Amino acid sequence: KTTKGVQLLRGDPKKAIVRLSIPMMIGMSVQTLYNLADGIWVSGLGPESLAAVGLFFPVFMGIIALAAGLGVGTSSAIARRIGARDKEGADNVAVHSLILSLILGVTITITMLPAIDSLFRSMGAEAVELAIEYARVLLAGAFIIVFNNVGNGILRGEGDANRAMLAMVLGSGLNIVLDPIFIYTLGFGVVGAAYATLLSMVVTSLFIAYWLFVKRDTYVDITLRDFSPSREILKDILRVGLPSSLSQLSMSIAMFFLNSVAITAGGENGVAVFTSAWRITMLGIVPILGMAAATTSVTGAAYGERNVEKLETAYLYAIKIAFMIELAVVAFIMLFAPQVAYLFTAQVIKGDLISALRTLPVFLVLTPFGMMTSAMFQGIGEGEKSLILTIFRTLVMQVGFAYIFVHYTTLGLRGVWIGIVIGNMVAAIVGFLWGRMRISALKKT
């Protein structure tokens, strides 16, 4: 009482959106960098070890979905309490969240551990025995993952994007350092990558726990004395958290469908082109996700203050900034499409990739309109609306239009990009309009 993060949340919405999203973009950029670097280390390990990480990836993304969902529910609930100047409430949500992190994280470990052997077998597959060992090491750290995301959520909720960024950067940075040492230098191979990740997550935890439990210099007070078991707080976190996790499920299922329309288009090489083009296009998603995190915090605090003008301002300003960022990203990709495709390429698919990079990432321009809407839906605590919009966007619109432009048309892979672009754009119009109606509704209430 008070921190810089809280003064930021309770101040001008524009300055808040800028000073929170930027550290987030930076932190997320480092995480993406770790991911790209790790893909290079693992690719050099051969065909069997590369496909061990393809086997555990859905489970790993499942854990992240759940951990990050609890994270954003925590962040949203705290930001709203702080906006309302409910200090006891904000403190209580923080401690509720940490206990939930223990409950969720450990539950994940004890459920998947006896299940993981039969899951890889019945998948239908060597590469298995490595994926099992890979799964074992990361499932051992499930609680660490969830705790880290919760601590990040707490920091974001009280406007501390600086230490949230720092934790991301420390974690992904150390993992970048540990990766070649563990995989090649120590000779652990692909399971080396898992241990590098586990240890990195641990170090991250040590920092977060130090800030939360030792220095205790967060805005929120975290203590079992200021803890009072609340049905409402639990429902509040889950009303954002659970639909948040289910949204990643929707993406994965849409990704399954999109992969299947791409072979039909298509072929094995058609799948490879789509994979490469999607991966490249998703690099421009990073600034949007950074802006979304900030949007949830700022609109949350503004919702707590019962200041709808402030909420609407932040939400619309976030859309503007993200929109302009994407213009630069899209123009860069389409202009340097041959150069980019060269870097990520197999040379006979390069022409197909260049066409994709000149077609696919167009929708990035309209993406902010729909995701900032989802972001603020979360900020006001209505995560089910965010899930509905995501389902509409990823499943109904992306896949439907891709399937239509492929199966009812002589276009090939081009039918996939066009379908995806159009679907994403329609979904963004609809969501933005839904966001406008919701805000108008807030103004008369």
Indicate the resolution in Å: 2.4
Radius of gyration of the chain (CA): 22
Residue closest to 160 by CA, chosen among 303, 8, 31 = 8
Breaks in the chain (C to N over 2.5 Å), named by the residue before each, are 125, 345
Handedness of CA 283, 143, 164, 377 (dihedral sign): positive
Please indicate the experimental technique that yielded this structure.
X-ray
d(C-alpha 286, C-alpha 97), whole Å: 26
N residues, the chain: 445
Q: At what angle do helices 308-335 and 337-344 cross, to 10 degrees?
A: 80
d(C-alpha 185, C-alpha 181), whole Å: 5
Handedness of CA 419, 424, 429, 431 (dihedral sign): positive
Q: Residue 99 — φ and ψ, nearest 5°? A: -65, -45
The helix (run of H) or strand (run of E) holding residue 230 is: none
Q: How far does Cα 285 stand from its chain's mean position?
A: 10
Nearest-5° angle of CA 65, CA 66, CA 69? 85
Q: How many CA atoms lie within 13 A of 188 on its CB side?
A: 17
Token readout for 315 is 């939400």
Domain boundaries, the chain: 1-445
